[PDB]
Amino acid sequence: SQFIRRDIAQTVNGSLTLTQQTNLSAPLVSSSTGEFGGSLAANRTFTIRNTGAPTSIVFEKGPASGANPAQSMSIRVWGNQFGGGSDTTRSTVFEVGDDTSHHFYSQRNKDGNIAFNINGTVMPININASGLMNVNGTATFGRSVTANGEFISKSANAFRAINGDYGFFIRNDASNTYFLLTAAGDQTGGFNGLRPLLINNQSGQITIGEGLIIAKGVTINSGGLTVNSRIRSQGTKTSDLYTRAPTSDTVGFWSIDINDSATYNQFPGYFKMVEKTNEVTGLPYLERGEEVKSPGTLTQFGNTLDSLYQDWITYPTTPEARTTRWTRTWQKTKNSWSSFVQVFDGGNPPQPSDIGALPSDNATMGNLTIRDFLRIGNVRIVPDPVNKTVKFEWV
Amino acid sequence: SQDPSQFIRRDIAQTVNGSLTLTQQTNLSAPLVSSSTGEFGGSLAANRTFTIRNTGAPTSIVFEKGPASGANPAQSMSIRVWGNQFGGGSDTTRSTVFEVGDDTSHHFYSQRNKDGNIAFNINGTVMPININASGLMNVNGTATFGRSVTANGEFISKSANAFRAINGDYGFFIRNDASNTYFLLTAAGDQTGGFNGLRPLLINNQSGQITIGEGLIIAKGVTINSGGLTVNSRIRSQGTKTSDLYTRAPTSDTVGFWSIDINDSATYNQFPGYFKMVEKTNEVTGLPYLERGEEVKSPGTLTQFGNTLDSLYQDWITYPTTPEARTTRWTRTWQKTKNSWSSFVQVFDGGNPPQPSDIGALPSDNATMGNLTIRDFLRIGNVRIVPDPVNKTVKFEW
Amino acid sequence: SQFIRRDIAQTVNGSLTLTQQTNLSAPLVSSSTGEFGGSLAANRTFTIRNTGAPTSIVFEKGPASGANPAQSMSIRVWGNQFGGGSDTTRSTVFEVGDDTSHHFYSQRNKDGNIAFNINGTVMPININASGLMNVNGTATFGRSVTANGEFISKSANAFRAINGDYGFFIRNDASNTYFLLTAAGDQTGGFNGLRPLLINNQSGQITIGEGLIIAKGVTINSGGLTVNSRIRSQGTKTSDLYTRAPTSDTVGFWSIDINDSATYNQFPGYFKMVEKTNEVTGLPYLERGEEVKSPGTLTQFGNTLDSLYQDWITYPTTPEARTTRWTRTWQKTKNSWSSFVQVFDGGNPPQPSDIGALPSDNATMGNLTIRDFLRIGNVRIVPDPVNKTVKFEWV
Q1: C301 CA to chain A: closest CA distance, Å?
Q2: Rounded CA gap, A225 and B236, in Å?
Q3: Domain's final residue, options A143, A175, A207
Q4: Mutation test of the interface with chain B: which of C30, C101, C270, choosing the one with the most B Cβ atoms within 10 A?
Q5: Do B106 and B183 sit in the same domain of this protein?
């Protein structure tokens, strides 16, 4: 009776020490602890039971040598829903980490949602998120960035292209949208004084501030044009300007400086003028001399092949030369230019021979008729219509 | 109690057929090997390694939730290592899966699929501090960045509305609708919305032709290299009005076409005025003619034409500012070689005709002249005077 | 002797085999291993002890059947800070994975910082990062991308909008910023030959290379305008052009082709000219005939309602027709156009009656005075004013 029996159930009240292998073929059921100085193994399932305190696995750090960690680590499954206090939303938490702080944890809250928190930098190879993305800090991309949706910036300086010494960028300052440039070597900085293009956010009016060059034509459909402070409409100078029929490309307003002898010999020149004086009145008048070829400005007006005309103004290249203007008109139905005619002005007056008038002095004519009187020197000759009589008076 | 084989022997191997209950500390110094289970009501510890063996069913660790109190979880959790490559069915790509989670659904899992690649799936929101990915990135949902976004490569949008800058009440954005690329604006307070009626700038995607639809202002000059210009429906080329316009030599900046309204006496007193006309009538023919009076100073338009310092001329047109005033035109030409403007000359027209003294013609009436020669006949009243060239005689007829 | 006692401490030197349930109610303390062929369970805590070598848990793969994994997996807690060698920065590492490679690990380095490394693709639903973002490879977004800060590209081709057959993009090639277009069907490719708009990064000067259209008006504040090689300023043609007072919208330079009888019958026409000949000199002169209505160009100059004038030029639509120019001036204070006056030119010379001069032949006048001599045929008549005499001479 004070020995243990091998055939029936017994209760051992002494402390046993087993020096040989122990073999079990039925459940081991303990109400206390289990320390093993060697490794341990179980089949299929290991369960950590909970009787009021959260369950955990602890990985000891061991001695500070070899491949051992600096701190012990643990896996703990816990919560605060039943904790009674400010926060009770962390329903189920699977937490990993060490003596200092957690490394990471996954959790399901009361609302049923799952979060996987990392207390540092996550370092994946690839990322593939099926839902949203939020990043509070600066983002950097090593290659292209493609979106099926819209790119949106809430920064004034919104979109920037950097290359070489210069940064170009789009800036919305709520009043206007600017296309701006940086100083050389300040690619990430602010804008310089240049204002290449801007758009008024309210009116849509565009302003270009550093000059504009256009190729292949400009058309203003409405509102007209205002220019400060000059317009150079420079026509196409060809050798055949005198006889060149207009085309749809050459109609319109323009000017050409014809300064080459080969061409302006074909155009009208100016006239040498001689100043003469009336012996009687002392009033001067100009008399036309020889035609002299001269360079000049050819100017065209009119917008269609029906409506087109030209002015030819000569300019002096010699100290004694004078300026004379000429005009012509395009004749579509005749398919030719009208002949140049001289413009009459104070420097190129019409001549008595040009209009069919009698010269003021030294004149010769076929016949003349006088009604009231004819004075010769001091002798007046007066007809008397009532009778058939003439009177010779003198003073 | 009788045979000595009904007690356990202490020196040799024994087989116990009774259930032992050990109430004191038990000490082992050799392997414990069971073919059955192990329940401990207290904690457990082992050295170096814990192994969960597999004999046909996947292995797991279970963390029980316990009573709903203190720091306990609402649900039990488990770590399970499993797969489906040998499962026999639709999917056999999940070779090795390390899964953590609870009664409801998994929290996360890492897996190596059959092609050998590793994936780490999170059934919710991953919440790191920093992110550093050595490879690709894909996001199916909306993305938001709290500060700048910098790329060594190209930003590419496949949206019609592709790039938007929002500030204050306005959103500006670039829109490619496949036919044209637009720079557009939103209504005030609709920064993320669609475009209004405004069309600031657009580009034809096929021709590259640009259309500006809300007006254009330019500074520091414009040049059209080709194609010319067409304007609807007027052009105001506004010249620089200075005090010395009368004697001002042209410069490379002032050559070209323009007009100036010279409306200040201080300046137009220097310019030609208009002439007063008096309408007189020939007693004989009854036909009227205009005779020039006094010159009267007047404001006017000065217009320049010509594009170079060689080729340049001006017209001066006066306009009336008094009820009886008249309009007269004048012309001049730039003389480079002489370095001066030619003097203004009067333009002759129906309202400002040339005078007989201007052209050297005899007045139609009350005229006085040096000498005259008549060839055929001279009539005075009713008396004709006719030369006979063959003889030396004149005859007097009635 | 040599049976086990059940009331006092005993040492068992034989290998016991327990075929029935074993019940413990006090600590089990082993210096060796523990294999269980069934499941295992403990309360509250399981601890893996470390005596010089890193601790781990192993999940066996089992037979290749059912839901078993292809490879065994393990959790290992280790480090290299005390390893003595090239790298000692991995202080505490919690690593999970298999024989081929690690699946993932979290680590605290010697600097105290935490990293969570994933040896593959991380696949979350949502992402919410409180700090920075870096991606070395290509990135793709399925919807919109919004930044509170600036978007910056360091690529030449910086920003691209793709739709339909065409890709539009902004390109900074360090010298100039271009707005470029792709060939049809090459949306991700390079630019074609088109050059819609460019901006010089140094000067800000804009160049448009494929033509320009403007609506609602253009204003050049400075620098003027230069055009190659013509300007068509097309005025607004209305039915009341003859009497139409200018408005602020119609002042300025333009031309109109008035080709409809309903309108040009109101304007001056041209004059038929007849060629006459001086009986004495044989020199021809032109005499004015009938006025014939004709289409023409109406051209306006001047920029204000004070400063404004027009020229009216007629063009021939019939073989015998001639061209005549006319002029008028806007009289603001009188609120009317001055009446059209004829321009005198070689083709439309003034008539003797227009200027008050005596015709060169067959003339009639009121009175005449001669000072020097009067010749009639062969008879000279010479006054001698001093002594009061007349002389009758012959040639």
Answers
A1: 12
A2: 6
A3: A207
A4: C30
A5: no
